[PDB]
Structure formats: C-alpha cells, structure tokens
Amino acid sequence: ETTALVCDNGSGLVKAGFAGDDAPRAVFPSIVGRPRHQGVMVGMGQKDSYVGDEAQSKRGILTLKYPIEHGIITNWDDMEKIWHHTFYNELRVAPEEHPTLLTEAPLNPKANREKMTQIMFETFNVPAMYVAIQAVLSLYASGRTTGIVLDSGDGVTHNVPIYEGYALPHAIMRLDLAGRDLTDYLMKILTERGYSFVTTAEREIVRDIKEKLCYVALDFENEMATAASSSSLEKSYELPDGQVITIGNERFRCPETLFQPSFIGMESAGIHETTYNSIMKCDIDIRKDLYANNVMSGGTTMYPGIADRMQKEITALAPSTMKIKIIAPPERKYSVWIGGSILASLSTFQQMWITKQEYDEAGPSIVHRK
Amino acid sequence: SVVEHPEFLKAGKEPGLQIWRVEKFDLVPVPTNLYGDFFTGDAYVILKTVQLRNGNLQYDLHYWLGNECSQDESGAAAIFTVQLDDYLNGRAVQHREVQGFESATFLGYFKSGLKYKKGGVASKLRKVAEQT
Numbered sequence: 234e235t236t237a238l239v240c241d242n243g244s245g246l247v248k249a250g251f252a253g254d255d256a257p258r259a260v261f262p263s264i265v266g267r268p269r270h271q272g273v274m275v276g277m278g279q280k281d282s283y284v285g286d287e288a289q290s291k292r293g294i295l296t297l298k299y300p301i302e303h304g305i306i307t308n309w310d311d312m313e314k315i316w317h318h319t320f321y322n323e324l325r326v327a328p329e330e331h332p333t334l335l336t337e338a339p340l341n342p343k344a345n346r347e348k349m350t351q352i353m354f355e356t357f358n359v360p361a362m363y364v365a366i367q368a369v370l371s372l373y374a375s376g377r378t379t380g381i382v383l384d385s386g387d388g389v390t391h392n393v394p395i396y397e398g399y400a401l402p403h404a405i406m407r408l409d410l411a412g413r414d415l416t417d418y419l420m421k422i423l424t425e426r427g428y429s430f431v432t433t434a435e436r437e438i439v440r441d442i443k444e445k446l447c448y449v450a451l452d453f454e455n456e457m458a459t460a461a462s463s464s465s466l467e468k469s470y471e472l473p474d475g476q477v478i479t480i481g482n483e484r485f486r487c488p489e490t491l492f493q494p495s496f497i498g499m500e501s502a503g504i505h506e507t508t509y510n511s512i513m514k515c516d517i518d519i520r521k522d523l524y525a526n527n528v529m530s531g532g533t534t535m536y537p538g539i540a541d542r543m544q545k546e547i548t549a550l551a552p553s554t555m556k557i558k559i560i561a562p563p564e565r566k567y568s569v570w571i572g573g574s575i576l577a578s579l580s581t582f583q584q585m586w587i588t589k590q591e592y593d594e595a596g597p598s599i600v601h602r603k
Numbered sequence: 604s605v606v607e608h609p610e611f612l613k614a615g616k617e618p619g620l621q622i623w624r625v626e627k628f629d630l631v632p633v634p635t636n637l638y639g640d641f642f643t644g645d646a647y648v649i650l651k652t653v654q655l656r657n658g659n660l661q662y663d664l665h666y667w668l669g670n671e672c673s674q675d676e677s678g679a680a681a682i683f684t685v686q687l688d689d690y691l692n693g694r695a696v697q698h699r700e701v702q703g704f705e706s707a708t709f710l711g712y713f714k715s716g717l718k719y720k721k722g723g724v725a726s727k728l729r730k731v732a733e734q735t
C-alpha cells in the first residue's frame with residue numbers, strides 16, 4: 234500500500250504527518266535559520282541553514298526568518314528548506330515515493346498555488362500532489378459541510394463561511410491579529426508589573442505563559458473589578474531558572490485583544506464583529522445555518538472561555554430570534570491537518586490527486602483545473 | 604474533472620431511498636432489508652430521490668451521525684455528501700442529521716420508525732500518542 238503525507242504549513246508551526254493518522258506526527262516552528270556572519274570564506278565545515286527547534290537553539294549565531302507571513306508563503310527559497318526538513322529530517326521519507334497533500338490559506342493568490350505545485354514536482358519529484366483550503370478542512374473534520382469557521386493561528390485570523398462544501402469567497406474576512414501579536418502584548422503588559430522581556434529569546438518564554446495561564450473573560454469589566462478586589466484570579470508560574478512569578482489580570486487582558494484590537498493600537502473590529510460581518514455578507518437564506526454552526530479552529534482559539542464569550546458576543550450582534558452555537562472541538566489545534574488526513578484517505582480521493590504525468594502535460598496551471 | 608465511484612454510478616437513477624454506510628474510509632451500501640437500523644457508532648449517507656411532475660428528479664442528501672461514531676467516519680460522511688452532490692451537478696440539498704435530533708423530513712422516510720443499535724464498524728484512524 235502507497236502512503237500519502239499531509240503537510241499543513243502555518244505562519245508559526247508546520248503540522249506534518251501521514252494520511253490515516255489522527256494527528257500530525259511532526260509539529261515544529263516554521264523557522265529558517267541562517268548564519269548571521271557569512272562569507273565565501275566564513276564557516277567552511279558548517280551547515281548553511283537550520284530549521285525549527287535546531288534553529289531556535291542556535292539562535293545566538295543565527296538570523297531567524299519566517300517564510301510564511303500571515304498564512305501566505307513569502308520566501309520561496311526558505312520554504313524549500315522547510316519542506317526538505319519536513320521530508321528528510323522529520324518524516325524520514327523519500328518524497329519521490331509519496332503522494333503529498335498540502336494546505337493553503339483561503340484567498341491564496343493563484344501564482345502562489347502554481348509555485349507550490351512547481352516546487353513539489355520539479356524540486357521534490359513527488360508522484361502526486363494536491364492543495365486544499367485550511368478552513369474548509371477544519372469544517373470537514375467537525376463533520377459538517379455548512380458552517381462558518383473562525384481560524385486563528387500564530388499569524389492570521391480568518392472568518393470563512395462555507396455552504397454545502399464550498400467557501401463563499403466574497404464573504405471571507407482576514408484579520409492580521411493573532412497568536413504572535415498576543416504573545417507580544419503579554420510581554421508589554423508584564424513589563425508594567427516590573428518583569429523584563431524584549432528580545433526574540435524571551436518572547437519564547439512569554440508564549441508558554443500565554444498558553445498555560447491565560448483565558449478569556451465572559452465580561453471584561455466585571456473581570457477587571459473582580460481582579461482589583463480579592464486575588465482569586467492570581468496564578469503562579471515557575472521560570473526555567475527556578476524563580477516563581479505571580480500573574481494577575483493579564484491572564485484575561487492578553488486574549489481580550491482579540492475582541493478589542495485597540496489594545497495593541499489596531500483600528501480593526503474584533504473577531505466577534507468580523508464574524509457577524511462575514512455572516513451578513515452571505516445570502517440571508519443561509520445565515521441561520523451559519524449562525525448555528527460556528528466552528529473554532531487553530532491554536533489561538535484554545536483559550537479557556539473563548540467559546541462562551543463568542544457565544545455571548547454574537548447573540549448581541551444578531552437578530553434576537555437567532556439560534557446561535559459555537560463548536561470548539563478539543564482537537565482544534567490540529568483540525569486542519571486532521572481534515573486533510575481524512576480527505577487523503579478516502580476511497581474517492583484516488584482520482585483527485587494531480588499526477589506528475591498531468592503536470593508534465595499541462596504545467597503548473599493544472600492546479601487550478603478542479 | 605468529476606468524482607467517479609461504483610456507488611456514485613448507482614445514485615439517484617430512479618425514485619427511491621438509498622442508504623450507504625461509511626466503512627473504513629469507503630462508501631458501502633446498506634442491505635435494503637436493514638434500512639432504518641442505524642448503528643450509533645457509525646455514520647451514514649442517505650440519498651432520497653423523488654419524482655417531480657416536470658420529469659426532473661429531486662434529491663435530498665442526509666448524512667447521519669451516531670453518538671459514538673469516530674472522527675474519520677463523521678468527517679468522511681460529510682465529504683462523500685459534498686462529492687455525491689457534485690456528481691449530481693449540485694442539484695441535491697444537504698442535511699446534517701444527529702442521533703436523537705433528526706429532522707421531521709428524514710424521520711418521515713422510515714414508515715415503521717427508525718431504530719438505533721449499539722455498535723458499528725471500527726475506525727481506520729491511527730491513534731497518535733503525545734510524547735512521554
């Protein structure tokens with residue numbers, strides 16, 4: 234039996250693995266490190282690059298770069314490195330032996346999709362490939378063909394309304410506020426409490442506190458007042474160095490930014506409004522379906538309390554008689570990848586792959602032809 | 604290009620009720636004598652074909668999800684539905700049916716009442732353990 238690979242390339246993390254598995258086997262930072270101090274005659278017996286954790290460890294001698302910006306591939310040369318590392322270092326497979334499914338952001342430019350096709354066939358020699366929209370795969374993973382997906386990762390947030398299996402392009406919303414911006418904010422508000430964190434090195438410690446102690450308040454004002462009274466919201470966190478710190482109203486102030494971007498000096502509307510707004514851009518006759526099938530997807534949607542706040546936030550925005558429902562599956566950090574693993578495993582998917590034969594005949598333009 | 608499958612070749616060719624069960628990533632027909640008997644651990648795809656006076660055929664696709672069905676099954680029933688609709692030139696109306704919360708229409712396909720049974724076919728998704 235031939236085994237398909239699934240690769241979900243994110244702005245912050247690469248999710249990679251094998252079709253048929255219930256989770257990505259390789260999860261690592263989408264980072265490429267290159268020597269800070271270079272030259273034709275500088276570091277002869279040394280690697281010209283590193284990827285993921287290796288790059289972060291050797292951060293002191295490297296220049297770190299993220300080839301995917303806000304869900305879009307922006308540095309082709311660095312992306313090939315990511316892919317190479319994925320195949321050879323993490324999956325330990327010979328690319329030329331496995332049909333490969335990749336993911337893309339909604340509204341991904343035509344030429345980007347072609348570039349991805351070309352590299353896979355021309356540089357990696359895959360026998361077959363296929364590109365799928367991230368948000369739609371999340372919907373499939375929740376066993377729905379209609380709903381609106383809130384996909385929030387490390388670099389981008391999108392609202393993607395889908396009907397009967399297809400996104401509605403006209404109604405998609407993108408917001409350049411996500412996980413990384415929240416990590417940066419928690420860094421800035423901890424300084425107010427005294428704690429010193431500015432460098433790229435410290436950013437990685439604050440991110441762990443963001444993922445362990447933060448949460449979303451049901452009512453931000455009351456929460457603030459309740460934190461000024463007793464200290465029942467206060468929590469302790471042990472530093473790598475052994476020191477202990479006490480975290481307070483920042484636990485809920487940090488993800489509050491998702492609802493009030495003004496906190497980071499952004500003038501956009503919050504994620505509740507962009508959701509309501511995307512829904513209102515759809516045909517009135519489908520809104521009920523959308524409203525009742527709000528799927529949350531991605532890392533930045535993992536904060537405890539997120540589903541209750543959004544439930545509260547959107548009933549306020551919508552017609553008084555609208556039945557509203559937020560679906561926040563425990564596996565939502567991997568929903569996209571899981572959707573792909575199921576899709577690539579289906580009996581009916583065999584004919585869907587783009588063959589090397591088809592590519593040689595038609596060229597990169599073939600990717601669009603579905 | 605379109606999606607081909609032996610079962611897709613059989614779908615909506617004439618008025619009636621067709622029921623397929625999701626079995627290890629494939630669309631498998633349910634024996635006609637067993638219609639209405641749903642395994643609570645499985646997911647199904649039902650196609651209802653009605654004859655219109657105008658000579659055209661009306662289509663209603665319903666994917667039914669048992670309370671104990673695995674992610675690969677519920678995910679695949681939803682995809683197969685999309686694919687069956689496309690094969691039918693998108694002429695079908697898609698309905699999501701959850702155990703104990705089925706719609707009045709769907710419940711009406713079964714004259715002697717729909718019945719729930721414990722069990723079902725195994726998942727084909729390989730469990731992935733977090734590092735020890």
Ligand SMILES: Nc1ncnc2c1ncn2[C@@H]1O[C@H](COP(=O)(O)OP(=O)(O)OP(=O)(O)O)[C@@H](O)[C@H]1O
Nearest residue numbers: 243244245246386387388389412444531532533535
């Ligand atoms: N348990 C958690 N609580 C809060 N935030 C989390 C949690 N786990 C992960 N995150 C944040 O989510 C991000 C990783 O999420 P994800 O893998 O869905 O996105 P991505 O693929 O990297 O980025 P994008 O899809 O925006 O291009 C990081 O910002 C991470 O800090």
Ligand SMILES: [Ca+2]
Nearest residue numbers: 242243244386
């Ligand atoms: Ca992603």
Ligand SMILES: [Ca+2]
Nearest residue numbers: 644645723724
């Ligand atoms: Ca089952």
